[PDB]
Amino acid sequence: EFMQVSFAPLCPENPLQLSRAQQAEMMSAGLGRPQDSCCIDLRWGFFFDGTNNNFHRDQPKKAHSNVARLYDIFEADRRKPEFVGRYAAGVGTAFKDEVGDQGLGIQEKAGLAAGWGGEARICWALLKFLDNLNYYFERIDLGEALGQKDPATVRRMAQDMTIPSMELRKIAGDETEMLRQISMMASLQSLTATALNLPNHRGRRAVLAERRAQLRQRVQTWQRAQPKPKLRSIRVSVFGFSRGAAEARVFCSWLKDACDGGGGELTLCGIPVQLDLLGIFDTVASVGLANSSRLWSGHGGYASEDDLRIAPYVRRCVHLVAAHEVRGSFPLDAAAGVNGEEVVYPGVHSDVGGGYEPGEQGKAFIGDSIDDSAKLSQIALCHMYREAMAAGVPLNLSASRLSKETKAAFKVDKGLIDAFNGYVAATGSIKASTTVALTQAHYALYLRWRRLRLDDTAPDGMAQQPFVTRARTYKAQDVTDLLQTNAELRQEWAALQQDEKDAAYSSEASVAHVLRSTLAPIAARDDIVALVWGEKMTQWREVKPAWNDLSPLDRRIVRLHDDYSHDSRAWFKPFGAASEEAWKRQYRQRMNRLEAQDNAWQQWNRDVQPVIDDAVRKAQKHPGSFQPTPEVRPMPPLVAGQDLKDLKQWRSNGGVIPTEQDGRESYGMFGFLRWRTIFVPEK
């Protein structure tokens, strides 16, 4: 039983069409068998969205993820209560009636920065697991039938919902986030005192055991009253993206807590439970601040190494991973130990899990029109759809309840199919056998694309390409992201070419200056700067051969990166404003303040000017008075420096808000000239 590694297969001409083998698998899964016989199989899907992915918030802009899209088409038919799908919002977004996560304020920042709220979402889905069986019998969830609101129940189950707001403030702070990145990058134990905030394992099990006892009495009552049809089995499938894939894995490990009292094969109220498919997109944990180990590795809180291991009763795991994701905040957690496939896909994190809005960064165009069907992540979506159908998951694209918009989310433009398959064909000779080697080989080709597009005065520069022209028509901030990030890559390379001349660390190294300038908590700790510097130079030497490879790149590879894949380092601004809307709000607030401060000074000037003129005319009339100057009211503070320049421009141009120019991960520590960090399971 093992995870076979490969690159993405060619996308079929109809990506929703099952292969002959997959159509056989679907039939043997039981989907389609009848209730005419004595028995029934319940089929339950659990869908955990990724960081800052929220289905109802993001579907209107067609930016809902591949997890949300598959959930949307899971059967929700009042005539089929045996099929139940449940959706957990991504961390950093609202999940309020479910767990009490408001998705604003410090709760939002802690969820985005550190995965806070993931434990609570797993606990909620474990309650839903019990609710699903009550719903079969009674058409109402069990907590609702008991008058028990889910947030209060989850708070008895989940440590993260008890963390005090002042502690959440610490977890989310800017400087704390710099320290987490340094700890991740340099394998450094925390320099500051931190809290572990481990899961409330005992409370979670205790709550599930009492909830399960309430469930068992009802199930036994209804089975006695009406034993037909017999409940033959419960078939579970679990899907996740990003931190939702870390949650999905830990949910599979903790599913034992919701099933009948331990001892052999999983059952619920005597009914066999089987886990037919774990379908996960690019697993990223990066949770918490520390754990009980020497190396935190992003494996804090619920996301321990032990529980991230694919649970042994997972019958099939399909893990689609992003070949070209390289952000330091998004290390990959590889999956092994069960039957299935780990398949490397082109693009960055949300080119595989979904979630870009069509048109962002000038991608997902058909001619000059924005079109969701041309989004790269549509290919991986259909791959997971075919695997879910083959595993017996009751996704129903034909259901009459479905919206036009819901069904259009599974459309795939033939131009994207051709560009995707051209990429696969151009790289078919690579043939690496592990996920680390396969991703590094495809990232090496990406680096050669970046070098091709590096000189933004030249015809082959990124700035001169059609996708940047399209980005300009879509959103000014996207162009700034793209081109500022290319400028930062020129700086990254120049700093490394300078610093590689001397293998020994110096305080005057270029990269050292970058680190001190961008990482305030360690700017006075030259020894820590030296440690980060040493790892950065090691990473450069790893990728230098690819970056320096000036052999022509296959045209098919260039086209995919120009027109389909996104640049996730470019837009990700953990040290900028919380969002573009927040950036704009803060600029308007700053200008409003500067206007008030200037209107206060100008009004002082007009009150004082007559007094100063009057003292002049008098000294002219009596040049001998020692006319000492008159005292006036205290002068309000002067708008000066950059503040005055911005205010002047703001008045002149009528209120144009400049785009946000920086805020990305430091290129002195992460940047493009590195390999993505990938944790490969213990064996």
Author numbering: 35 to 717
The authors write:
Using biochemical, structural, and physiological analyses, we determined TleB as a phospholipase that mediates interspecies microbial competition in X. oryzae. Here, we demonstrate that the T6SS-secreted phospholipase TleB acts as a cross-kingdom dual-functional effector, mediating both interbacterial competition and host manipulation. It hydrolyzes lecithin, exhibits toxicity to E. coli neutralized by immunity proteins TliA/TliB, and enhances bacterial competition against E. coli and P. syringae.
The structure adopts a shovel-like shape, with overall dimensions of ~120 × 58 × 65 Å. Conversely, the C-terminal domain with an unknown function diverges more significantly in structure, comprising helices and loops that form a shovel-like shape with the “shovelhead” over the catalytic pocket and “handle” formed by long helices. This crystallographic analysis delineates TleB’s domain architecture, highlighting a conserved phospholipase module and a distinct C-terminal domain. Two TleB mutants, TleBS240A and TleBH347A, were constructed by substituting alanine for the predicted catalytic residues S240 and H347, respectively. Our analysis revealed that while wild-type TleB efficiently hydrolyzed lecithin, its mutants failed to do so, indicative of abolished activity. TleB demonstrated strong affinity for phosphatidylserine (PS), alongside phosphoinositides PI 3-monophosphate (PI3P), PI4P, PI5P, and PI (3, 5)P2, while exhibiting weaker interactions with other lipids like phosphatidic acid (PA) and PI (3,4,5)P3 and PI (4, 5)P2.
